[PDB]
Design a protein around this ligand. Structure first.
Ligand SMILES: Oc1cc(CCl)ccc1Oc1ccc(Cl)cc1Cl
Ligand SMILES: Oc1cc(CCl)ccc1Oc1ccc(Cl)cc1Cl
Lengths: 115, 115, 115, 115
């Protein structure tokens, strides 16, 4: 994976399972074009979003659908979603892990970027 | 003051000063329209974004211009900005504080909803 | 006020009220001795722990009694408490704010050192 | 591993490599007895601390030596260390991952607990 997403649940201390994730890439015109999407597994991880061929230089937005996740568990959370926006591969190809830690009124996000 | 933004710098252990903040309201066509903006003060806070009269129920996006903040300090950041998207409702009686804690490759955001 | 503690609840999106806080100073035999204590107020803050005169250079431990906080809300927490250990120095001119954001299986703490 | 520690660096967006970790277990008398120790690998992970036989019910403290980590990188951080204190295996045996995200004036810690 050049691009992986990992989500944890801070209330239960567990992976956040079945969290929808949509990724977009800023187009020529300056619009958010759909790029890839998927759902976290039982480990809270989403693999297979893209390949190193597809995953060119650009500005990407990883939208993590936190509100849906919390609602389905009986919690009415503050945020609509967690959005993570970043320039990727601008110094050549790299592997990105976008991690998110979710609470109903709070989240954190960290990127681990390696060669 | 129904809406307030407060940003901290986790690398220096200080308020994040002079950070640009842009707020958008979701329009009926699904577009984000400018709503309010400013720069955090010396205390890292941004007051007077809006009034009770103009802060109606709706979906808002608060964008914190983290990349510019880090670049002015000579530090290479990961994110384009941090975005906080939420629905404001029951109008009341409710003050919203969006807090953000910034690192170069990581941020958290929390909502403190009081009164 | 050279030392202040502020705690937020990430599950409710609110100040964490009535949280017990115990502070210890490291004694020359390597033991922690009681230094100051109190409970956070309605704003989630705890002021008047100490004075400039009694807050000398030294190693301090601030223990936030998170487990009791969660149990009074009917929620099963992971940690016994959150501990924040640091050296206070250059005496000045320096106000220390220890901030903490609490979830049942997770917390962050940040130091805001001003003046 | 019934007990694993994983540490990331929020400034560089990378695993925090070679971070010393010491674990203690509260004894009968009420003292912190040394239990296990080790250093994070290139992945930021510390495996092999203990076995399911050794890792009995008890109150454990995982001390993550953050100050040493930051100093060796030319940063003078706020905290002496990150301490994570919790009751383990009190409802039977479980697998614990203690994760930490480090910034010079800030850290978070999350526990992922599975069967
Ligand atoms: O983001 C925060 C994270 C922590 C845990 Cl490190 C503590 C405080 C924070 O920021 C705040 C934001 C708003 C208000 Cl009213 C109070 C606070 Cl303390
Ligand atoms: O970012 C994180 C920070 C902490 C400390 Cl509170 C705990 C979990 C995190 O999420 C990850 C971070 C890095 C990697 Cl490789 C995987 C994951 Cl699930």
């Amino acid at each position: 994976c050049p691009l992986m997403v990992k989500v944890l649940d801070a209330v239960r201390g567990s992976p956040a399972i079945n969290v929808a994730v949509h990724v977009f890439r800023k187009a020529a015109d300056d619009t958010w074009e759909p790029f890839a999407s998927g759902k976290t597994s039982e480990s809270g991880e989403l693999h297979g979003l893209t390949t190193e061929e597809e995953f060119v230089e650009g500005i990407y937005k990883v939208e993590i659908d936190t509100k849906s996740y919390w609602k389905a568990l009986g919690i009415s959370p503050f945020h609509e979603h967690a959005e993570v926006v970043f320039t990727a591969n601008d110094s050549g190809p790299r592997r990105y892990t976008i991690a998110a830690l979710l609470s109903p009124y709070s989240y954190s996000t960290t990127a681990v970027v390696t060669n």
